[PDB]
Write a protein that binds this ligand. Sequence first.
Ligand SMILES: Nc1ncnc2c1ncn2[C@H]1C[C@H](O)[C@@H](COP(=O)(O)OP(=O)(O)OP(=O)(O)O)O1
Ligand SMILES: [Mg+2]
Length: 382
Amino acid sequence: DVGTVVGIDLGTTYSCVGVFKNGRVEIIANDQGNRITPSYVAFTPEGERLIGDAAKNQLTSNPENTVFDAKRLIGRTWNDPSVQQDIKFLPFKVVEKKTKPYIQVDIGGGQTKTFAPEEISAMVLTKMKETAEAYLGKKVTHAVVTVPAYFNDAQRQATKDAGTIAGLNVMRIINEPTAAAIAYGLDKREGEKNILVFDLGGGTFDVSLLTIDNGVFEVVATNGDTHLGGEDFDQRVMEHFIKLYKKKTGKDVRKDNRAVQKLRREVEKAKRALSSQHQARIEIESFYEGEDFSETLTRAKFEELNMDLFRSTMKPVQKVLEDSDLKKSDIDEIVLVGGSTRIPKIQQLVKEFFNGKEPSRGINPDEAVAYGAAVQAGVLSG
Ligand SMILES: Nc1ncnc2c1ncn2[C@H]1C[C@H](O)[C@@H](COP(=O)(O)OP(=O)(O)OP(=O)(O)O)O1
Ligand SMILES: [Mg+2]
């Protein structure tokens, strides 16, 4: 008896879980009321392991003990050129063990631990499992987990292995863009269609061209930017306000880890607010050296600070069309994935690229991948 199988989007920056409950797919809010959970792990002074919102939100003078982006390393060998570049930029220690990347952190009480990427991912999966179990009022043992379409055999197996550590039998690994298309019911249609999936997540940008032919998907071509996402838009705003603060006060706040973390938290909140408002206030009590911070950010300024990054998302779309031997007019559906596709300017740019065709966001773009995973999981449940 496999019980009730859940669907999990195990994301680079954010993860999401869904399940078929009473004849309906439900995207499940965690204990903080959020339907997405940061793929983050940290530790309290007492050595309590924090996972998710609690990990990402913990203020710390030692950010090197906060782990995230394990998906960038999972299933890769040490001298993978991707690993060699990412270890330059990740703020926690990644060390070579047995010719593979491992993550080294202090976990409280002066104790150091080294973790495989799949061990970090397993902790994230455990949190997602617990979120689902609380909602269902029952134990969960089996899952369908999603991965990027470009993931290779080793990365897929490593993701299953993360599940095993977390007490989950990952029965199926399915592709993210396909899961998004399945959320929209595109698998349950007679005939053939071309589907462009535009997936701008927290850390990565993936564009995929899928064909769907009587319920069978083919991933025809993929492109994007492995280091472009919502976090980068936040950083542009961060840099803007750090510069402004130094101009106004003479102080460079980059000296204080906790001050930068506070500003980051408020920038993330302001950015989200600017998807539905034209201005947002950023206010921080005792920001730096006991002085308060209070500034407004307009949507126009947010857009100006990021316009080059937003425009850069179009070239990968044109490349995917070329590699699929398709023109813009051959695209039957445009599926938006990732919270960053809630940004009015991104939606506008996509619509304009496709000459007025409205991109689909009727299912929350941050939830669509988990939603499709949960549809697939529903058929496997006993
Ligand atoms: N990564 C993001 N970048 C920019 N805007 C975002 C991002 N994620 C969400 N938003 C915007 C869209 C909405 O205006 C707002 C809240 O979105 P979300 O958390 O998905 O809740 P929601 O729109 O379903 O509302 P509710 O929970 O109240 O029902 O933030
Ligand atoms: Mg994603």
